[PDB]
Design a protein around this ligand. Sequence first.
Ligand SMILES: [K+]
Ligand SMILES: [Mg+2]
Ligand SMILES: [Mg+2]
Ligand SMILES: [Mg+2]
Ligand SMILES: [Mg+2]
Ligand SMILES: [Mg+2]
Ligand SMILES: [Mg+2]
Ligand SMILES: [Mg+2]
Ligand SMILES: [Mg+2]
Ligand SMILES: [Zn+2]
Lengths: 36, 206, 165, 142
Amino acid sequence: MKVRPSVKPMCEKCKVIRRKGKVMVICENPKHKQKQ
Amino acid sequence: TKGILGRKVGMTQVFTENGELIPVTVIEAAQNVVLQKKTVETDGYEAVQIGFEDKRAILSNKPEQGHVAKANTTPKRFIREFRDVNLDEYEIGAEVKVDVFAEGDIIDATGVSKGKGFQGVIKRHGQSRGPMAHGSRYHRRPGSMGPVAPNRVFKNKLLPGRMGGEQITIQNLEIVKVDVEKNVLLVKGNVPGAKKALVQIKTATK
Amino acid sequence: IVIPAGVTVTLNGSTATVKGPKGELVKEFNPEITIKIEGNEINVSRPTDNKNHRALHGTTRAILNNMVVGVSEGYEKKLELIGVGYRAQKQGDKLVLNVGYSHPVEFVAPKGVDIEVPANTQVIVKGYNKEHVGELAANIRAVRPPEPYKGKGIRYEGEHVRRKE
Amino acid sequence: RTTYMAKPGEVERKWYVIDATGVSLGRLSSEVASILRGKNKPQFTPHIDTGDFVIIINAGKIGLTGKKATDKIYYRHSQYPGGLKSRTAGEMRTNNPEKLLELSIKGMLPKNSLGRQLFKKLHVYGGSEHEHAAQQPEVYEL
RNA sequence: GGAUAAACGCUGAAAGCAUCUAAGCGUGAAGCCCCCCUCAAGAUGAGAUUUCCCAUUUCUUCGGAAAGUAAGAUCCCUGAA
RNA sequence: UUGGCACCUCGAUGUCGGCUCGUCGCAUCCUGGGGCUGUAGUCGGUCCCAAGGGUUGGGCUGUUCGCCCAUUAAAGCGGCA
Ligand SMILES: [K+]
Ligand SMILES: [Mg+2]
Ligand SMILES: [Mg+2]
Ligand SMILES: [Mg+2]
Ligand SMILES: [Mg+2]
Ligand SMILES: [Mg+2]
Ligand SMILES: [Mg+2]
Ligand SMILES: [Mg+2]
Ligand SMILES: [Mg+2]
Ligand SMILES: [Zn+2]
């Protein structure tokens, strides 16, 4: 995980979602896991 | 779970079959009797009320006499409840000998520690003496109460006072020997309290 | 929205039951939804078309359908073991795994779930409750999930393990 | 000159029962406080307890809107350093709801000798049953 | 042990897929509540159980009082664990 | 922290360092849990949750700091005149 205010897609496979009131992105790439 | 009350007779040491040497406290646990059997419906908690020593009817009184007569025995000096214990055992009036235990059986010993009087902090609470030279005029005093900002000193700042008399349980002691004739129980190591003190021995919670 | 042979759907307010050849499934749904019944088919609707009701419409439909497909055909999930020494067995109705730890790990399949050992490198979960099937498969996989550098561990058979140098 | 001031014992004082099921903690407590202080009566006199005695049942079913079950936090302090102990409103509703409504209503009563005396007139039960049938009490509706 | 954090997930839509969440389920920390030790009913919310003493006499128009006792406890005395 | 302001105190609010006693925060040093890894394993880097407990003894200096010797699981940063 990378915890950042700047949660944005890093590729085209990244997918923004809203889990527990927080913006995450999930991708197949584990690096792209972003939390806000 | 199983328990008795006893008096501390003293300390000695015993050789085991290995030739190892084992200090032991001696507990004399005569005249133990069951006096009342408390229930969840009568009281709210299950327990067994044991009385330990026989005493004289002029040191007793008519209330205690009645309570023991409901058990069909004499007035008693020490009376104590034990919990976490089965009540299908322990019929009223029954005598409760040391033979309930066994060698190597494992216990908690609960008693009232010895009386040191008014003591200071380094003995009581283990604090450190300040230097005794190099100009010190601070040897056995307690230290700073605290900082300035509260305008007060916090609770549990530890200070002189009356040291002992506190109740203490020692855990996971081992029973070495049982002698039903002498009404004697041997315990590896120690227990709290002076000689002639009451000890409450019971099967260990863990 | 099929209701195949043998299935019986019953309702009482927010509660519901579905019986069938393979088990009973008593569950609940929130009452705000609306039901309509045919002998082979049961439909669902939402009164107001606001956020929660949209969320719950397809949810409730899918969950009913899962209940139905479970009682009528059940569910299977396949886990394969990858790695020398990684061994599976069942002592009757108790799975046991021997996967390179200094001990084995055992599992019990709760009421409605069942295990199967078609081989030492292969185990399968079976049930009529999809939730329990997936959960027990997930927990069984959780013991040695796949490492990338070789793939050594449990995995679903159609899982796309990522590997590295 | 001349306007009525009550006297202790001058006023009949009744015993009321409330089903706390589904009502919000604060709304129920606000109605109960006024009953206890005696503002439903025109015999009200600020320095005298004209109010009634009150019973609350099914307190474990008291309503808590929002995430208050997890996020409304009750605090106690032992006056020892770090003697702060927290507990959630939902947990209290489950285990010790009597103390919950007690806490709510205490902060809504006056902070005096009288208000302390008024708190004693409250008898709370998380169940449907109470001990005070001997007083044969009436239902109150909010 | 019970419930959680971060985290991992099951099922599952909103949004014919996908998604650990939105409804709902599970795992999950030396931490939280308990387990263990101690104090604790002045806990004026003053709790409970067991046993004991009994319903005296003067008065006072009432309230209420005092004046000897019971169960029991002490002044006093020998003392220490 | 360096500073700026000069608002209480000049009919007195005692200073550095140390000793005694600690207590609090978390921006966690160790122990504990976890995600990413340019994570093979051992070791590690970075980041999230965690403040429960623990966090050395000496040589030089008045010294804080700092250098050094030797250990440690670790030898935390800071607030409380
Ligand atoms: K000055
Ligand atoms: Mg020293
Ligand atoms: Mg001196
Ligand atoms: Mg758990
Ligand atoms: Mg002055
Ligand atoms: Mg001065
Ligand atoms: Mg942090
Ligand atoms: Mg020097
Ligand atoms: Mg030096
Ligand atoms: Zn991506």
